[PDB]
Structure 1
Amino acid sequence: EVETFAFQAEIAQLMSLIINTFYSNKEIFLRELISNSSDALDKIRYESLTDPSKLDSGKELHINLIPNKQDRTLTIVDTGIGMTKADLINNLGTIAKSGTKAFMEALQAGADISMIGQFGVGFYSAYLVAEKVTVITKHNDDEQYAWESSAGGSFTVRTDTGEPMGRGTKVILHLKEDQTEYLEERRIKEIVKKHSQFIGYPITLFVEK
């Protein structure tokens, strides 16, 4: 049972800009996704200060980077607060709409794509390198869900039947054909050190077999 939703016109028109605009500095997608993971870890950590039972779904707060050359996928895993069903359909779209509109006014006023994080819509930077993004998320107050979109104006939301996650968000980037450099070990290390050096959570690179 999969529900298909239409992107808001402002968001879909931002995603088409990100996918079609010639922009070589694509490496900033990792900074934006890690920064989003850092924010999610900050939220569950703050909640645990007054309610230790919020960590019953997982005490460790970290970010894991899992490249896969065979599947041509780069996975960013965090144990943050996760996302509810209302987040994936209603709440985050409201924040995305106001942030997208402001980001696009700035893009016409000289700003470039790399400043997407200053508007709170840094997740859409994943489509600089990915032709399809699958998001597995689990919130303490909801069930595990699967978000997926190949852009094109629509996304899907469904209950995830796969491996239980406990708590957090897993972003699976199905990379484009010419973006496989972000599956290399030394390339990921250079980007993490350059852009995410001061993230207050351990970022572990899972190196392949």
Structure 2
Amino acid sequence: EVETFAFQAEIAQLMSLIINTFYSNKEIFLRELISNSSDALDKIRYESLTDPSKLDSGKELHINLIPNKQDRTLTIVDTGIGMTKADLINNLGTIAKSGTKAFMEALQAGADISMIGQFGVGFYSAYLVAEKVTVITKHNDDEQYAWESSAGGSFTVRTDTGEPMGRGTKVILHLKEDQTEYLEERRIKEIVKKHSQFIGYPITLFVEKE
């Protein structure tokens, strides 16, 4: 059972601006997604101080970067707090409406796409490099869900039947054909060192077996 939803109009306009604007500095997408993972890890770390049982679904707090040249995917996995169904369908998009409006005003005033994280809508920079994004997520208070979108104004949410995650979020970037540099180990290392060197959780870059 797959449910299909329209993006709010502002968010659809934002993703079309991200997909259609000429902007060469695409690598900032990785900083934004790692920043999101770090925030999610911060959240479960704080909550577990007053309720240790929140870590029953996994005590390790980390971020894994998993390129896959065969599937042409880059996966960012964290063991943070995860996202509920209502987060996916309504809450986070509602919050993103004001930040989207502010970011688009700033872009008219001379800002540039690299500043997107200062508005809280950095996730959508994934569409700088990805033609489709799948998000698998598990919150302690809800079931495991798959969110997916190829832009175009709509997204889907379904219950996930894949491997159980425990707790956290997995962002699967289905990369555009000309963005496969972000599958290369030395390129990912360079980007993490440049933009994410002080993230307070272990970031493990998986290497490919082939």
> TM tier, shorter chain?
over 0.9
1:147-178 residue CA offsets vs partner (Å, 9 max, x unmatched): 00000000000000110000000000000000
- Distance across 1 between alignment mates of 2:52 and 2:152: 42
1:89-123 residue CA offsets vs partner (Å, 9 max, x unmatched): 11101111111011101000110000000000000
1:39-70 residue CA offsets vs partner (Å, 9 max, x unmatched): 00000000001111000000000000000000
- Distance across 1 between alignment mates of 2:90 and 2:74: 27
- Give TM-score, length-normalised by structure 1: 1.00
- Give TM-score, length-normalised by structure 2: 0.99
SS in 2 for 1:99: helix
Q: How many angstroms does 1:187 deviate by?
A: 0.2
Pairwise CA RMSD: 0.4
SS in 2 for 1:83: coil
Unpaired runs of at least 5, structure 2: none
Equivalent in the alignment of 2:185: 185
1:7-30 residue CA offsets vs partner (Å, 9 max, x unmatched): 011000000000011111000000
- Distance across 2 between alignment mates of 1:155 and 1:96: 15
Unpaired runs of at least 5, structure 1: none
> In the comparison of the two structures, how many residue pairs are matched?
209
SS in 2 for 1:137: strand
- Distance across 2 between alignment mates of 1:99 and 1:85: 21
Identity across the alignment (%): 100
- Distance across 2 between alignment mates of 1:137 and 1:29: 19
SS in 1 for 2:70: coil
Aligned: 1:129 with 2:115: no
Q: How many angstroms does 1:132 deviate by?
A: 0.1
